[PDB]
Design a protein around this ligand. Structure first.
Ligand code: FE
Ligand code: FE
Ligand code: FE
Ligand code: FE
Ligand code: FE
Ligand code: FE
Ligand code: FE
Ligand code: FE
Ligand code: FE
Ligand code: FE
Lengths: 140, 140, 140, 140, 140, 140, 140, 140
């Protein structure tokens, strides 16, 4: 390996696995408290899934749904509930690969920049999903 | 967005787009000097493609080949020529998704840790591909 | 293998292959009685296909259509005819991977919880598809 | 929904999300103690991923590698280190979709039957990966 | 091999390769006469592509577009121009895998039953595409 | 629709859904008699899956394995146990998409020509899988 | 190899890698001047990606978005901002594989015929993306 | 559209659709003369399929097999029978995406450079497949 240096290098910021896990677990716990069955994903700004947790009894569609919501939230640094509303004036946003413009994903930032998204799916409504996503973010 | 802080955060190091582009271009130029027609990819340690360049006249198999070689080199922090030899004692390494254990990818490090791979494909041999990959890394 | 125990374990409920097959066959028979040509799928709540049957003369689009309808019905524990109507107020539900919000899938429960979906496709209308799906469920 | 009953129903056994998470976390912790950077997956016998955790600094190939190892271990109820050796007399086992016959996955049972696999990838050898997988299973 | 017999067997009807080729070529020729650049596909009722022809200068999106139109036409035994209009009252028809509800595919029958679809893409409008598809069918 | 006629048409022969189902069920029953847990697929010579049945307790890898074995057997009109042995002198046969050169698939013919393959997976050996596949074919 | 000749041959025109790279780099530079973080792709009329550049800090959805926009622009020889408006009277255009009908892709021609598309994604609006795409084309 | 000029442009050479079709048809005819049932593909050096023809009675694996052989032959400008032999000293060549290192593909050149590959599959041996591929090339 050549070693790069130095004006050739840049840094990015991430949740640690420990922090992403804590947040994911908090979202599951919040759903469980309410008798809901959800899957939860935490996705890095660099578009990698860091944590997934499939709740007991969660619907089989919820796992990928949670992942895509998280990816979508971190991509636009916005809750997916709000992003869904953007489809009114830009309906083809939802044609972008890997996205899901449906309430339940919320971003997490560091220094004003998005670093992760937390996505939840499996509750009876996207708005409830997003409540639990926010509960996961809240522990950070 | 919740803002994370701070023991909850970690940093990683990357080539800038400028540096990845310079390296990719150098690999193409080295092949072109020799009358070779190659594709070149630079892939981050976080497994994202940063740059691709498809050489004039490069075979159609070369584009994905270059990408996979780069990914493989950065995953193991080793030239793919050497990694290919590991298949003698661990033949199922090559079953790992997204990999290509074939000469032509080389890693680039920062602070001793892998940060990118440069992959080249399209020359008459993997060893020549890897020569041009090293020529790209050499400018960093 | 470590053996897990015991507060660490939970149970889920499923149709037996025998029951899923009986239901699938009944849906085909109901379509055949009417001179219709359908494919039928039974999909578990855990999102696995348990049975598929491709009717003689069924259109080539019907096989995957039936599978996706079944998956969709068991995911929301609701007939897909009704789920399709939810798209009026949540249009991006249909962006969830693996789903098909089109009449012809119906859920089957045990103890109040969804355990399988039966999906039918290939009839001249989704409503007819769903008639045959219900005929399959009816034998359980 | 028709409600099924009763000779038409069967039960299966699973790790709870709580147990799968505890095991995954233990595998990560064991790797971290040794200064290793791994991804960990827990996959149910019904072939669904229940938990994934991407270690800080883990190679980008490790995430899918861990998932596939877990799936492979639970499919044959055997450590993937041993399964790899079966390729000597059945070399096309590795052509089965979704599999990875490479040390690092280990099964977990309940009542003598496989219920989950734990897969680890990212250490310098499959044998080390499998050490950490066993450390995760050990807490169950 | 066991040999099946006989109440266990059924027959289906197909275009010969010779006939499918003649039709595809006629569609290309009709487009070429008009200075249009199209791709053409003939897809069997059993959902297999029998012939593809990529016109000189045809857009890169046209090849798969033609295939999907042909598949869609033979699946519903109707021109895709008409099928597109069905989306007004069944908008999720277009979520069925492998389909394209866009003018340019037309069915071919034998004994009243659909046996193939011919699909064309690459002209300035779907209606023109479908003109050339009909020109291909017309030689049968 | 243009109607084709007549030197433009050819016929092919198939198992009826009824026959394919009978055979699949017989293979499952033979495995169940022995306390084995298998998936079974019947695939037409035209490469379409006609029937799948997932046995109670069958490993999650078995479903696709059974499908691919059936496809492979009907493609070469030979048991996959024998086809696997061909890899000695043509090792890249197994690189052909959709194939699985592993004991457990067996062909069924009509008029000397292959019309279907029956594939079984999930038993402790491919040879046992193929025993149950033959038991399914035997009822035809 | 047989050598073809000569009425059997035709020529097509392309951007050189050098030109495609210059254009891609100009689009990135234009975004960077404005403090925007984008990915840029140049896609040939024959539907191959020639260059990709992932901007520092660009969202993870931007890379594929840029590629698809470029492909879409070169397929119809029109800016994707305008193509998006065509969805009003042909809504299923967007069902064509590989496309993205969202502002940010612009075509480049030679002799009146499209030879490449330049696509940009990652800015706060498609219209801004398309500004930077035009800035890349402008250097040619 | 910006119009590019001129040191920014390069040309490539291709078979016309007419020539590719003539060659494909000749390969089918040669197989048919011998009572063989094959699929045939012609793939451009730029990696696009130009023509496919599925022979009456051809195995379902033959269609993709023919396509991949053609792609492989044009990528290395060599018959796939010879390329297969290269696997002895570079066994991971076959891990390159989209390839099939199995006799039956042959290249076609213009001005010494590869412009297309013709691939055939479905005969009882790769060597016979390649005979028919050569018969198709021979008419050019
Ligand atoms: Fe509730
Ligand atoms: Fe040379
Ligand atoms: Fe091998
Ligand atoms: Fe009818
Ligand atoms: Fe829509
Ligand atoms: Fe170490
Ligand atoms: Fe025109
Ligand atoms: Fe046993
Ligand atoms: Fe801004
Ligand atoms: Fe013969």
């Amino acid at each position: 390996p050549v070693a790069a240096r130095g004006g050739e290098l840049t840094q990015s910021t991430h949740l640690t696995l420990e922090a992403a896990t804590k947040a994911a677990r908090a979202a599951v716990e919040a759903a469980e408290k309410d008798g809901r069955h959800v899957s939860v994903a935490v996705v890095d700004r660099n578009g990698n899934t860091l944590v997934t947790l499939r709740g007991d009894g969660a619907g089989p569609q919820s796992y990928e749904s949670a992942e895509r919501k998280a990816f979508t939230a971190v991509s636009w640094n916005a809750p997916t509930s709000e992003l869904a509303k953007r489809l009114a004036q830009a309906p083809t946003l939802k044609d972008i690969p890997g996205t899901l413009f449906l309430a339940g994903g919320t971003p997490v930032t560091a220094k004003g920049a998005p670093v992760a998204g937390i996505g939840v799916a499996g509750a009876p409504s996207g708005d409830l999903d997003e409540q639990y996503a926010r509960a996961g973010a809240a522990v950070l």
